[PDB]
Design an enzyme around this catalytic site. Structure first.
Site, PDB file in Angstrom:
ATOM      1  N   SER A   9       0.247  -5.020   5.122  1.00 23.34           N
ATOM      2  CA  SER A   9       0.221  -5.233   6.563  1.00 23.34           C
ATOM      3  C   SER A   9      -1.231  -5.369   6.997  1.00 23.34           C
ATOM      4  O   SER A   9      -2.143  -5.015   6.250  1.00 23.34           O
ATOM      5  CB  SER A   9       0.843  -4.038   7.275  1.00 23.34           C
ATOM      6  OG  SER A   9       0.086  -2.866   7.009  1.00 23.34           O
ATOM      7  N   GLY A  24       0.835  -1.187   0.000  1.00 29.24           N
ATOM      8  CA  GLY A  24       0.000   0.000   0.000  1.00 29.24           C
ATOM      9  C   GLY A  24       0.873   1.242   0.000  1.00 29.24           C
ATOM     10  O   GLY A  24       0.514   2.285  -0.563  1.00 29.24           O
ATOM     11  N   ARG A  39      -0.510  -8.544  -3.854  1.00 28.08           N
ATOM     12  CA  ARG A  39      -0.484  -7.510  -2.832  1.00 28.08           C
ATOM     13  C   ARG A  39       0.350  -8.018  -1.661  1.00 28.08           C
ATOM     14  O   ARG A  39       0.203  -9.160  -1.232  1.00 28.08           O
ATOM     15  CB  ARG A  39      -1.902  -7.163  -2.355  1.00 28.08           C
ATOM     16  CG  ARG A  39      -1.927  -6.233  -1.139  1.00 28.08           C
ATOM     17  CD  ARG A  39      -3.341  -5.770  -0.772  1.00 28.08           C
ATOM     18  NE  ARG A  39      -3.544  -5.737   0.679  1.00 28.08           N
ATOM     19  CZ  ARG A  39      -2.875  -4.958   1.527  1.00 28.08           C
ATOM     20  NH1 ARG A  39      -1.962  -4.107   1.080  1.00 28.08           N
ATOM     21  NH2 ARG A  39      -3.133  -5.020   2.829  1.00 28.08           N
ATOM     22  N   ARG A  52       7.463   1.642   0.396  1.00 29.14           N
ATOM     23  CA  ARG A  52       7.811   0.240   0.619  1.00 29.14           C
ATOM     24  C   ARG A  52       8.189  -0.399  -0.722  1.00 29.14           C
ATOM     25  O   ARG A  52       9.083  -1.244  -0.794  1.00 29.14           O
ATOM     26  CB  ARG A  52       6.646  -0.521   1.265  1.00 29.14           C
ATOM     27  CG  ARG A  52       6.879  -2.024   1.347  1.00 29.14           C
ATOM     28  CD  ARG A  52       6.185  -2.683   2.544  1.00 29.14           C
ATOM     29  NE  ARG A  52       4.725  -2.580   2.515  1.00 29.14           N
ATOM     30  CZ  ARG A  52       3.994  -1.987   3.459  1.00 29.14           C
ATOM     31  NH1 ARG A  52       4.578  -1.437   4.519  1.00 29.14           N
ATOM     32  NH2 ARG A  52       2.679  -1.939   3.344  1.00 29.14           N
ATOM     33  N   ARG A  87       9.091  -2.074  10.726  1.00 25.08           N
ATOM     34  CA  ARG A  87       8.774  -2.950   9.600  1.00 25.08           C
ATOM     35  C   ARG A  87       9.922  -3.924   9.308  1.00 25.08           C
ATOM     36  O   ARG A  87      10.566  -4.444  10.223  1.00 25.08           O
ATOM     37  CB  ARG A  87       8.489  -2.110   8.349  1.00 25.08           C
ATOM     38  CG  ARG A  87       7.385  -1.071   8.513  1.00 25.08           C
ATOM     39  CD  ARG A  87       6.016  -1.708   8.700  1.00 25.08           C
ATOM     40  NE  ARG A  87       4.995  -0.713   9.017  1.00 25.08           N
ATOM     41  CZ  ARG A  87       3.731  -1.001   9.312  1.00 25.08           C
ATOM     42  NH1 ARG A  87       3.325  -2.262   9.327  1.00 25.08           N
ATOM     43  NH2 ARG A  87       2.875  -0.030   9.602  1.00 25.08           N
ATOM     44  N   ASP A 131       0.006  -5.128  13.694  1.00 29.67           N
ATOM     45  CA  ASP A 131      -0.664  -4.598  14.867  1.00 29.67           C
ATOM     46  C   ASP A 131      -1.677  -5.589  15.398  1.00 29.67           C
ATOM     47  O   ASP A 131      -2.200  -6.415  14.649  1.00 29.67           O
ATOM     48  CB  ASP A 131      -1.348  -3.270  14.513  1.00 29.67           C
ATOM     49  CG  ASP A 131      -2.407  -2.864  15.520  1.00 29.67           C
ATOM     50  OD1 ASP A 131      -3.578  -3.257  15.330  1.00 29.67           O
ATOM     51  OD2 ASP A 131      -2.077  -2.163  16.503  1.00 29.67           O
ATOM     52  N   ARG A 162       1.177  11.268  -8.853  1.00 27.37           N
ATOM     53  CA  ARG A 162       0.600  11.330  -7.512  1.00 27.37           C
ATOM     54  C   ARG A 162       1.502  10.678  -6.460  1.00 27.37           C
ATOM     55  O   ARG A 162       1.061  10.356  -5.356  1.00 27.37           O
ATOM     56  CB  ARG A 162      -0.792  10.682  -7.505  1.00 27.37           C
ATOM     57  CG  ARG A 162      -1.860  11.491  -8.254  1.00 27.37           C
ATOM     58  CD  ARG A 162      -3.160  10.706  -8.394  1.00 27.37           C
ATOM     59  NE  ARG A 162      -4.253  11.517  -8.932  1.00 27.37           N
ATOM     60  CZ  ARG A 162      -5.022  12.327  -8.204  1.00 27.37           C
ATOM     61  NH1 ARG A 162      -4.831  12.443  -6.893  1.00 27.37           N
ATOM     62  NH2 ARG A 162      -5.990  13.020  -8.787  1.00 27.37           N
TER      63      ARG A 162
HETATM   64  C1  LIG Z   1      -6.934  -2.154  13.135  1.00 27.50           C
HETATM   65  S1  LIG Z   1      -5.175  -2.453  12.615  1.00 27.50           S
HETATM   66  C2  LIG Z   1      -5.409  -2.172  10.840  1.00 27.50           C
HETATM   67  N1  LIG Z   1      -6.649  -1.859  10.333  1.00 27.50           N
HETATM   68  C3  LIG Z   1      -6.821  -1.641   9.009  1.00 27.50           C
HETATM   69  N2  LIG Z   1      -5.880  -1.684   8.032  1.00 27.50           N
HETATM   70  C4  LIG Z   1      -4.632  -2.001   8.544  1.00 27.50           C
HETATM   71  C5  LIG Z   1      -4.385  -2.240   9.871  1.00 27.50           C
HETATM   72  N3  LIG Z   1      -3.086  -2.529  10.101  1.00 27.50           N
HETATM   73  C6  LIG Z   1      -2.469  -2.475   8.889  1.00 27.50           C
HETATM   74  N4  LIG Z   1      -3.368  -2.147   7.878  1.00 27.50           N
HETATM   75  C7  LIG Z   1      -3.346  -1.917   6.391  1.00 27.50           C
HETATM   76  O1  LIG Z   1      -2.416  -0.833   6.160  1.00 27.50           O
HETATM   77  C8  LIG Z   1      -3.125   0.350   5.773  1.00 27.50           C
HETATM   78  C9  LIG Z   1      -3.688   1.139   6.969  1.00 27.50           C
HETATM   79  O2  LIG Z   1      -2.655   1.560   7.846  1.00 27.50           O
HETATM   80  C10 LIG Z   1      -4.164  -0.161   4.796  1.00 27.50           C
HETATM   81  O3  LIG Z   1      -3.517  -0.285   3.524  1.00 27.50           O
HETATM   82  C11 LIG Z   1      -4.533  -1.521   5.457  1.00 27.50           C
HETATM   83  O4  LIG Z   1      -4.665  -2.582   4.546  1.00 27.50           O
HETATM   84  C1  LIG Z   2     -15.343  10.758 -14.100  1.00 23.16           C
HETATM   85  S1  LIG Z   2     -14.124  12.134 -13.850  1.00 23.16           S
HETATM   86  C2  LIG Z   2     -13.685  11.769 -12.138  1.00 23.16           C
HETATM   87  N1  LIG Z   2     -14.246  10.716 -11.467  1.00 23.16           N
HETATM   88  C3  LIG Z   2     -13.897  10.451 -10.184  1.00 23.16           C
HETATM   89  N2  LIG Z   2     -13.005  11.126  -9.410  1.00 23.16           N
HETATM   90  C4  LIG Z   2     -12.449  12.183 -10.093  1.00 23.16           C
HETATM   91  C5  LIG Z   2     -12.760  12.507 -11.387  1.00 23.16           C
HETATM   92  N3  LIG Z   2     -12.078  13.586 -11.823  1.00 23.16           N
HETATM   93  C6  LIG Z   2     -11.293  13.975 -10.786  1.00 23.16           C
HETATM   94  N4  LIG Z   2     -11.470  13.149  -9.678  1.00 23.16           N
HETATM   95  C7  LIG Z   2     -10.923  13.036  -8.286  1.00 23.16           C
HETATM   96  O1  LIG Z   2      -9.496  12.756  -8.467  1.00 23.16           O
HETATM   97  C8  LIG Z   2      -9.148  11.420  -8.018  1.00 23.16           C
HETATM   98  C9  LIG Z   2      -9.319  10.328  -9.082  1.00 23.16           C
HETATM   99  O2  LIG Z   2      -8.505  10.563 -10.212  1.00 23.16           O
HETATM  100  C10 LIG Z   2      -9.991  11.225  -6.791  1.00 23.16           C
HETATM  101  O3  LIG Z   2      -9.261  11.787  -5.710  1.00 23.16           O
HETATM  102  C11 LIG Z   2     -11.269  12.025  -7.152  1.00 23.16           C
HETATM  103  O4  LIG Z   2     -11.719  12.854  -6.090  1.00 23.16           O
END
Ligand SMILES: CSc1ncnc2c1ncn2[C@@H]1O[C@H](CO)[C@@H](O)[C@H]1O
Ligand SMILES: CSc1ncnc2c1ncn2[C@@H]1O[C@H](CO)[C@@H](O)[C@H]1O
Ligand SMILES: CSc1ncnc2c1ncn2[C@@H]1O[C@H](CO)[C@@H](O)[C@H]1O
Ligand SMILES: CSc1ncnc2c1ncn2[C@@H]1O[C@H](CO)[C@@H](O)[C@H]1O
Ligand SMILES: CSc1ncnc2c1ncn2[C@@H]1O[C@H](CO)[C@@H](O)[C@H]1O
Ligand SMILES: CSc1ncnc2c1ncn2[C@@H]1O[C@H](CO)[C@@H](O)[C@H]1O
Lengths: 237, 234, 232, 234, 232, 237
Positions: free
Chosen positions: D90, D20, D87, D24, D214, D204, D43
């Site tokens: 974590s 994610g 993927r 990393r 990590r 966690d 981005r």
């Molecule tokens: C309640 S502990 C927990 N909860 C939810 N997501 C977690 C968590 N720990 C690791 N991840 C994952 O990493 C990102 C959110 O930090 C996300 O990319 C996610 O997949």
């Molecule tokens: C159909 S055109 C469209 N659709 C959906 N999201 C858009 C769109 N245009 C700009 N955004 C916003 O930017 C990110 C997705 O690229 C997202 O952060 C989102 O807020």
């Protein structure tokens, strides 16, 4: 024949009584029908046809659950010319005043299933019995000196529910009996244009979870069958 | 004895093969098990226990639909010490590259039932099989020289669906077979702490309408199931 | 006494007839009841209590929609001891065989509302009438030489629905008439342990004024005579 | 180039490991890949391509949450010829027998997102991984002497859930790890016709609150993923 | 002309004030409007059209509940050319800081109804008012030396809900008042491209009659003066 | 510090502007803030703090999607004392009259997500912005000679939707802009008691799917940032 019924048009009467237990269909044919013959046995879901006081009647098990009975009732209606389906089963009671052996008639049937929502565009379809069939049953029962309760049944998908909180809800809204097929049979009847009715005998009171003597229990179950058979005769008039 | 099974602890093996048809279980007991003994007949849901190459095994029908099999698989697990449930049923195909008598293994099972949402706070519970059992079945098939696809099954509440369009959606997402209980057995295995696997034989093609009216490939499915438990024992 | 009904226990009979249009309550009171007296005027929802062939009867409008009628039916039941609610209204038909001016009796009521799901833990609650009340209405109708259809009604939340195809679905599943209160009253009756019934006349298929008044009076007589049969 | 990836067909390998965290992926490219070349930074979502023992491989972050990874995994599959998505993230543990740094393999993924219901007519779609990839990962772990549980993951939309009780329900049903994208990647793989697998490292513990702030076991996860593709190639 | 409004195009102004209680429409017409004339009486839902400081204004009740008001607001918009709908009503408060008689303005409206899901493919449609109308009401209030809170309303289908804990949830998410129409009117405005606003006075916290009338007249003046600001 | 933000109380201003792209936060700090310093970099989600005309302002990316931005906004409010969140992003347009480069202000935000239903007992929570913040933005824009549209935004979970039928629905109900975060940020603001506002620049018209010149596009985006920064100053008064 169909994939679940090895019979041909004519093998079933235009009225079919249906217990959940296939062994109970055999019991009903043996006990109340004259010259009954087995007209189905696939998957062991025994079906029979004979006469009750001269009227051609059929009786076949429908298995447990909405998915099961939905298959059988659907095939009876579209492939065997069946007009009426009378389910005759057992149910549990949640209301303190509904007693063991009471005869319940499901004018309506609440449900846990998603099948009617799938049919009714995700809205609330009130799964109801055919009014005339309900009336015939009530009248037949009166003639037998029996006082049947008429109200809502609850058709469950899970006999063993995880959230036991549903029984309080059922009781709060006046559900008379808890079973597993009514709502599904009524859904089928409405979708394919036939008539159905579910009658049940209270075999368990969830508030006390009991059964009682066996002779008296068997007596009430038979009265229920009598009520079903006699009700189709009133309907014929 | 349980509400739907008149037997006692010990009458069943720790592993039970389960077809939807009680008459199929009888056939399995008579064709593959030695010293087969009937241990149940309540509501006609025939159950049997015997041995396969010295391995104690049971086979009992579970009826059609999630509500039916949920009752049986539950009582077996909570009152008869059943550790593994292996459903051996039939299914309908939607994919064009799937032909009659093909063997499918549901590592997962989709459904239009609400049972799992009722258990999972109305969220998406991924009804999956036990990985070891899947692997066992795959190896068994391989050794028997029988082909078998592994993937998602679709457990339907309505055999006669009013939403024909849903078959296109199933096909679009690669559903191997349309049956009526896998997702419910997986949900039960999870809720009551046991393991389960569904193996199916394509008995009908929803598109072409060609269908069976059994055995042989239905015999393959059985061989794969019985041989997979043995691998699991080792 | 209650938030929407300025009356006290005793002012209402244990049986109350309820039309959607509030103006119809006074018409019924003056046309079919003896010794009628006014018992409510809050928000213009006039209520009356009188007698029909000696039987104590009340009449008051409930407004359009499940939310409106749910308020009145509820208060009547929990604070004025009402045992039965008979909704007497109109509906639209989707079936070809169901004609204009037909009298429909809702043994059941479907709906696109969420009230009953809120009550029944998001499951399917079959909103149904009291069986005896249904049977009474049928028999009272036959005695008046009137043929009434018994079946399912559909209680809509939106009179002007954006989903045009829902009407085809209603027709497919045998819906007898489309209105907006039945399922709500049936839910209330269930929730508070009372009895309810919805009778409707087909006023539109999806007529002269004299024809409309005739059929309306027929529905009222039916409801009133059904009550008497219920007392026996 | 796609709306979120400024690269051309060929810049990515047919297999892509995806954490994610974009930082990393950079670490993975620098620590495990030879001749690593950056192929994207739109981005800040860093993407890299190189080789692992002569095998061409890519690694690119997918951001947090189903909506984020759905965009990236989709563009890779439809415009860059990616066949497999692995993927490597974590997760949070709910089970008591699960400790920090444990490795979990999601053969399935539950979720509280609506994305799959939007795709599956509001029914239950069982978001599952590709069986071969699961098997590959299991064998790779075995050969590396690293432990790994196989089962259900739970993909959450809200890291900070207002429904704490749902953790008990997750635990009751044996959820191995709580993360935020597996179910969305599986849904995309299915809708766009590709294969995917999610391997996670417990970072966690939702009950005890002990957590990382990590590597190493995070290095194990990577080894298992990279070694599993090689087995998949054979 | 329409099923629930016996009037013709032109009878209604392009702006219509709507109270829940039908009896309040006549009070507003006689108390705040000049040269008022009656334009509707069907089902007792009296409608009036007059002028306020020269500006053409109409007033008519909408009944209780989303289903009722959805009918009237819809017909007014598609058949009588109404551009803006200002609902002026009452509500119950769940927040401790929100007091009895406070004036609340619903920039948004939550709801337990299913109407908007039916409209928005089962997704979440944020039922909202027109921003200018909200701003106008706020400014008109300040000019009258009245402090009005702007936020979310909750439009309930069941006045008597079986789920008691929902009120704690509403409080947690800052709901300013509980009523029964806002979300329905906002949905209709969106569906048919018109503008709507809901103003409410706190008449109950989950007062003398003279205090009630004072606050009610304050809400009306606010609505009427906001319309004038909107014309500028 | 938190698992997603390596900062300490004081590192952020009580007002945070948030673009989806972390590289855009850096761009905003560089372009409009005086003496801006990086206060976060974990996962590369760059955050900065500096001053705009003497006022302490912060700007940090929130990633794409409701799940992503829900984490950041939640931590800013509960662990960093942030009172206001101003999202500054891009959106697609479905209404024929909403043109490229129009500035849209989300007074409300519709959504595809299930997060607010999970918060609101499965009912309809109207995800709305803070009224005062909306008013400040409208006024700041007027001062800049810009006419912002105020209405509903639609926050999508799937940028690449399977059922393209949703765009007609969005247009039918007057949705001004289509993006992916608003509804989630408003849900967070309501749950934890803070204030939020989403402003977007139309970068794509779904009816024609376009972009146009780049200089003019960059100009409007900056006006949007100007509107956001100037709006917090009006709020301070
Ligand atoms: C309640 S502990 C927990 N909860 C939810 N997501 C977690 C968590 N720990 C690791 N991840 C994952 O990493 C990102 C959110 O930090 C996300 O990319 C996610 O997949
Ligand atoms: C159909 S055109 C469209 N659709 C959906 N999201 C858009 C769109 N245009 C700009 N955004 C916003 O930017 C990110 C997705 O690229 C997202 O952060 C989102 O807020
Ligand atoms: C809580 S007591 C109870 N609960 C559910 N179903 C019951 C019950 N009692 C009888 N039945 C009906 O019999 C079958 C399940 O055993 C099913 O066919 C069902 O109709
Ligand atoms: C559309 S073809 C089809 N559809 C649904 N179920 C099928 C089908 N074919 C086989 N089965 C399975 O067998 C029983 C229903 O006959 C059930 O036990 C079921 O699992
Ligand atoms: C599509 S035709 C139709 N649709 C809905 N309701 C109708 C209809 N016809 C009569 N009613 C009933 O009258 C009121 C709505 O006008 C409500 O009181 C309602 O019961
Ligand atoms: C719990 S207090 C409350 N709850 C719901 N609605 C209220 C309430 N108070 C005032 N109203 C509004 O007035 C009518 C219902 O009486 C409806 O028109 C409604 O807008």
């Amino acid at each position: 024949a169909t994939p679940h019924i090895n019979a041909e048009m004519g093998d079933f009467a235009d009225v079919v009584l249906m217990p959940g237990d296939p062994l109970r269909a055999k019991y009903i044919a043996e006990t109340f029908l004259e010259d009954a013959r087995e007209v189905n046995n696939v998957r062991g879901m025994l079906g029979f046809t004979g006469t009750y006081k001269g009227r051609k009647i059929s009786v076949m098990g429908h298995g447990m659950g909405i998915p099961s009975c939905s298959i059988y009732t659907k095939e009876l209606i579209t492939d065997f010319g069946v007009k009426k389906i009378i389910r005759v089963g057992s149910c549990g009671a949640v209301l303190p005043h509904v007693k063991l052996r009471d005869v319940v008639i499901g004018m309506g049937a609440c449900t846990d299933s998603k099948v009617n929502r799938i049919r009714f565009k995700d809205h609330d379809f009130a799964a109801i019995a055919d009014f005339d069939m309900v009336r015939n049953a009530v009248d037949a029962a009166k003639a037998l000196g029996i006082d049947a309760r008429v109200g809502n049944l609850f058709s469950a998908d899970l006999f063993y529910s995880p959230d036991g909180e549903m029984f309080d809800v059922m009781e709060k809204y006046g559900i008379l009996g808890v079973e597993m097929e009514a709502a599904g049979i009524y859904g089928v009847a409405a979708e394919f244009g036939a008539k159905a009715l579910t009658i049940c005998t209270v075999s368990d009171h969830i508030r006390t979870h009991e059964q009682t003597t066996a002779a008296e229990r068997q007596t009430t179950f038979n009265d229920m069958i009598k009520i079903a058979l006699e009700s189709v005769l009133l309907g014929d008039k």
